[PDB]
């Protein structure tokens, strides 16, 4: 089997991407944030505290003839941005782009933090990291990909995120029309539960490539590119007027600037992030200070190849017995 679904930016900055997902019988379609940095499929629901719902589409398990309460199971998650959610668990039929999993754990939110309430375009998350990070207790649950894997033509999914445009998540096959050149594969460590790999270095603009190992995670659920302070300083030093602002919470730059590109290494290959992808616009409405898309990871504890980086590539998440990642230009 295979599946193929279009993923669409939630706003003009590509702050996140939503993908339609069918849950239950008859189908209830919710727009979920596919997140390769976490492993819980959770949704706004008929159980979510009413004051914490503001425009989202909810899953109502009592209207699904295939929903079953997973007795005793609870979940609670906190994300790197400080957001969180928690609730109870149902199993139900979940379909993405024509690919159907029966018995998928659907985590129903009883509580969500303010940032989720405030984003009316995201109805929940669909985790695609390794199932060892799933938060369901006392019986940990499998991700949608883990459940589908055995049935897929090939045990893979791919992320093809657009810049200011829709893109595609495919399951079970690699669309050879969707990228240029060849795909370069690189080793993955699953020890932290993430799609964790080691980039071979970087370049700023037309500058010479620096060979240096950068361990980080491929995370579709993070907007920006988070890299060591040395690397980020070298990038922003090439932008007149750019500076790190403690009051704003990162590097800012004059909105009048033209940004240089940023290249990262995948083995002997190179992925080029155009400068425009690094512009996240005014820090507040009407300001001439703009927020940078490359930021320091020094306060995180891990480097994160988020959407800024991934949307410059066609990315293969290979869930074979020994997982690997593949990157191609496009």
Cα distance between residue 115 and residue 125, in whole Å: 13
Catalytic (active site) residue 35? yes
Burial classification of residue 148, based on how many CB atoms lie within 10 Å of its CB (0-12 exposed, 13-18 middle, 19 or more buried): buried
Q: How far is 317 from 294, CA to CA, in rounded Å?
A: 23
**Whole-angstrom Cα Rg for the chain:** 20
- The Cα angle at residue 40 between residues 329 and 124, in degrees rounded to 5: 80
Residue of 14, 33, 35, 219 with catalytic role: 35
**CATH number for domain 5-174, candidates 3.40.50.2300, 3.40.50.150, 3.30.1330.10, 2.40.70.10:** 2.40.70.10
Contact 127, 143 (CB under 8 A): yes
User: CB–CB of 5/97 below 8 Å?
Assistant: yes
CA atoms within 13 A on the CB side of 71: 0
If you write DSSP's letter for every residue of 71-92 in order, what string do you get?
Answer: EEEEEEEE-TTS-EEEEEEEEE
Q: Largest Cα–Cα distance of the chain, in whole Å?
A: 60
Contact between 305 and 294 (Cβ < 8 Å): no
Task: List C-alpha distances in Å: 182 to 185, 187, 300.
Answer: 10, 17, 33
Q: What does the alpha-carbon distance between residue 59 and residue 324 come to, in Å, rounded to a whole number?
A: 34
Opening angle at CA 246, ends 244 and 249, nearest 5: 85
DSSP, collapsed to helix, strand or coil, labels residue 242 as: coil
CA gap 315, 330 in Å, rounded: 10
Cis, bond preceding 255 (omega within 30 deg of 0): no
How many CB atoms neighbour CB 309 within 10 A? Answer: 28
Measure CA 161 to chain center: 10
Tell me if 5-174 shares its fold with 175-330: yes
β 28-35/124-127 pair status: parallel
- Resolution in Å equals 1.4
For 60, the 3-state DSSP assignment is: coil
| C-beta atoms surrounding 142 within 10 Å | 19
Method used experimentally: X-ray
Strand partners, 328: 314
Instruction: Kindly give the residue spans of alpha helices, DSSP state H, lying in 88-143.
Output: 114-117
Q: Enumerate residues 6+ apart whose C-beta is below 8 A from 157.
A: 128, 145, 169, 170, 171, 172, 317, 319
Contact 195, 158 (CB under 8 A): no
Domain map of the chain by residue range? 5-174, 175-330
| Tokens standing for residue 81 | 């941005």
Class of the domain covering 175-330:
mainly beta
Annotated catalytic residue, options 45, 108, 199, 261: 199
- Stretch (H or E) spanning 235: helix 229-236
Q: Give the integer Cα–Cα distance in Å for 325 and 300.
A: 22
Which residue, among 212, 205, 224, has the nearest Cα to 293 in the 3D structure? 224
Euclidean distance between CA atoms 200 and 198, whole angstroms:
6
Is 85 an active-site residue? no
Cβ contacts of residue 138 below 8 Å, gap of 6+?
Answer: 72, 73
Alpha helices in 54-191 (DSSP H): 114-117, 144-148
């Amino acid at each position: 089997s295979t599946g193929s679904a279009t993923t669409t930016p939630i706003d003009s900055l590509d702050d996140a991407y939503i993908t339609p997902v069918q849950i239950g019988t008859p189908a209830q379609t919710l727009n979920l944030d596919f997140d390769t940095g976490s492993s819980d499929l959770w949704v706004f629901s008929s159980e979510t505290t009413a004051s914490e719902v503001d425009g989202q589409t909810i899953y109502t398990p009592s209207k699904s003839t295939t929903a079953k309460l997973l007795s005793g199971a609870t979940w609670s998650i906190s994300y790197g941005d400080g957001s969180s959610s928690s609730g109870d668990v149902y199993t139900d039929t979940v379909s993405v782009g024509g690919l159907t999993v029966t018995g998928q754990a659907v985590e129903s939110a009883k509580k969500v933090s303010s940032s989720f309430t405030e984003d009316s375009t995201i109805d929940g998350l669909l985790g695609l990291a390794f199932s060892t990070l799933n938060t369901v207790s006392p019986t940990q649950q499998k991700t949608f990909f883990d459940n589908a894997k055995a049935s897929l033509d090939s045990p893979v999914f791919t992320a093809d995120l657009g810049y200011h445009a829709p893109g595609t998540y495919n399951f079970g096959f690699i669309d050879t029309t969707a990228y240029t050149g060849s795909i370069t594969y690189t080793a993955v460590s699953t020890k932290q539960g993430f799609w964790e790999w080691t980039s071979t270095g970087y370049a700023v603009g037309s500058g010479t490539f620096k060979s240096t190992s950068i361990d980080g995670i491929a995370d579709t659920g993070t907007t920006l590119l988070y890299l060591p302070a040395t690397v980020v300083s070298a990038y922003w030093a090439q932008v007149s007027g750019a500076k790190s602002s403690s009051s704003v919470g990162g590097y800012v730059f004059p909105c009048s600037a033209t940004l240089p590109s940023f290249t990262f290494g995948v083995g002997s290959a190179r992925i080029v992030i155009p400068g425009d992808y690094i512009d996240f616009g005014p820090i507040s409405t009407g300001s001439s200070s703009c927020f940078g898309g490359i930021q320091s990871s020094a306060g995180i504890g891990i480097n994160i190849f988020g959407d800024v980086a991934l949307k410059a590539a066609f990315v293969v998440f290979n869930g074979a017995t020994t997982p690997t990642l593949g990157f191609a230009s496009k």
